[PDB]
Symmetry: D3
Subunit: 156 residues, 6 copies
């Protein structure tokens, strides 16, 4: 399947997500990077969103709570081009029973090949890339072509 060269916009649509024991960490990261982040459009799952607004006076579009459908809302937005950078701080050691599934989100982000930070150090590289504030070129694999060939083969 084909690899296409696609141009991406200067102003980004950034989804901000954190597992519960990473919420204060995300808050702090956002707080040191306010100047750059305030040039882009920002979204968050419900509770992280409230925290940002409440502790920073930040302007963010709030989706539903991650475990109550907010994770699928943001995944759908990725697939519709309405989010194009994912920042997801997650708990690799003691995650809550309800803490949002990292897999499905990173998967749909990989399908659409968008920038993803799943470590805080990755987010620091992302936010300081010249590509953050500029137009840039990305390679989109033609997964639709691949998928349909396979489906037709099975179905006949």
């Amino acid at each position: 399947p084909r690899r296409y060269k696609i141009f991406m916009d200067k102003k980004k649509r950034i989804a901000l997500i954190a597992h519960d024991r990473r919420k204060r960490d995300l808050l702090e990261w956002v707080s040191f990077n306010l100047g750059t982040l305030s040039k882009h459009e920002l979204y968050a799952t419900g509770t992280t969103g409230a925290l940002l607004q409440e502790k920073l006076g930040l302007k963010v579009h709030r989706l539903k709570s991650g475990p109550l459908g907010g994770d699928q809302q943001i995944g759908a937005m990725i697939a519709e081009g309405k989010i194009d950078v994912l920042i997801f701080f997650w708990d690799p050691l003691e995650p809550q029973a309800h803490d949002v599934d990292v897999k499905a989100l990173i998967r749909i982000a990989t399908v659409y090949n968008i920038p993803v930070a799943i470590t805080r150090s990755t987010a620091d590289f992302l936010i300081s890339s010249p590509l953050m504030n500029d137009v840039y070129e990305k390679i989109q694999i033609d997964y639709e072509e691949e998928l349909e060939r396979r489906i037709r083969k099975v179905v006949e």
Copy 2:
């Protein structure tokens, strides 16, 4: 947490999904039950929906290909109250690598307690119930309250 009651409408919004080797089975099921399904609003992932339009001339709202984000569109729509019945025929023996993930959709259908058929016989019971064509009462567990309080104790 509290359990509270919601009355659901007579006319349903029904999501139809099939794993690749179950596509023809779901087509045969829809074809045999058209009189009843034609009273309702029908939705489907990309390829299953085209197949229904082509083979049956059925008026179905087509979403993206399931593996390319249609699954998450449908999950988002369940959480938003835009879908209130899920019919998903799946492959329990030989699923393809890309076959739509059953767990995440049944998870979100269960959070919002909507009727779900993940076997063909379950589907025959659903469509024959008098509640298919009438309003009925569902119990909605107050997951937002519990969740909010747990998140609080962690972030605190």
Copy 3:
């Protein structure tokens, strides 16, 4: 592989299962549906079973505790035709470490295409279908034919 038309009995063999935080919910559901349920034969995992007997004076065959083998006993019973309706209320948000695996049970129920309720609203549709108290027709996929063709190919 072939799809066979198979007739199923008027009197059902119903397995009743609940994750810990759904046990009181299952109790209440059973309590509003006693009249219909008392026409069929009923089974439960060990602790749910005891609860039903203790809080309702219900007659139910008790298997082992779900996490100590009761889940496999009921799956085996499905595969031997000794259970033919599954009612499983489960915890989509805060499940216990030991709470019975939903996947394996829904899988073997799909192999044998029996009616399954994994939401309480699904159970209300099931119990009110005319098929609940009548003989009905079901489609059994010939999974055995499919499996053996595949196995022989690998083994030579």
Copy 4:
């Protein structure tokens, strides 16, 4: 919870299972160790058992095909005390989609602390141990007590 001691019998009840690409390996292992295995009671999933009967003239109790419920029959029998050794040769590289799930069987073997060989070399150590042909002592953790008390605090 309490740990208590159970004496196990000299004559074992042994479940033999192999993933499709390991079927010939298990046949060669059984064939090389017949003198010892012939002293014990032998059980197998559907296709592995037929193969042993055909190729070696071995008296093996055949269960259902593993992917069609034989795995759960065997898990139920472990929990019931009807199987007390599990020999399972599995494919760690290229398993088929239907290949029997390793986790659920080792889970239940561990709950009931029975000897388990999930590598061929482990099997050579098991069958050569003097405990293969004698009675021995096993520690059984009182999982029912702990479980019961946890379920109680939740339902309460």
Copy 5:
């Protein structure tokens, strides 16, 4: 792919691992089997290691804490031949969020076909096999040959 006959050493390199609620159990097992275990070289994840040294005066090489990379250190050691017996007592009912993943470790042990105990009764058979203190023969599947044929096919 080929099955090769490979000779293994009399003196073993044993990795000792326990989930948190099995740590005291592993301690006790080691304490009844000190005489045999002291003939071989012993390794453990960080915290289990400390416990053994602290409660038994045992000489063991300590890797990092299992959840902080110790599990991958031991898996790498298996793949490099530096560990050739795995003893892993694990929690089948109430595992901690951080408790070491059993799957990846048993998988790499199966790739390299080494003796594995994942039940305490299995460990008692292992430690009493004459093969424990002797040279023995093992069958190594040529997984490398298989893998490369597959990779070349995809990549072209």
Copy 6:
């Protein structure tokens, strides 16, 4: 637990990994970014590394085949501080059965908070950041302290 600061070096130790159907993509990416990658120390799983040596004459340290233990070698090296950037191009649609597990590597990269690219566009942001070629500060959560205290309360 405490969050503390570590300064990372100008010269990076970079692990390069690709699922089989992404091997050619990673080769094209490395080829386009050679000027920058040649300033750093490069590591790769077995087959990806040979391909880079063959096609680009690149000096890469080759580890074992990913599915035969190279993945765990790399995870061990991350935990040991021997790798401080992970570039992993993976197949979100049609992964092979043996394709390297994404979760375990991103888990350990997150424990030790190193920069991670699991999409090609993330990789273009990483390599263009001024932090690629300078020293930078990372936050290391004190996971060993928390873990140690939790293990203690359990064993106690």
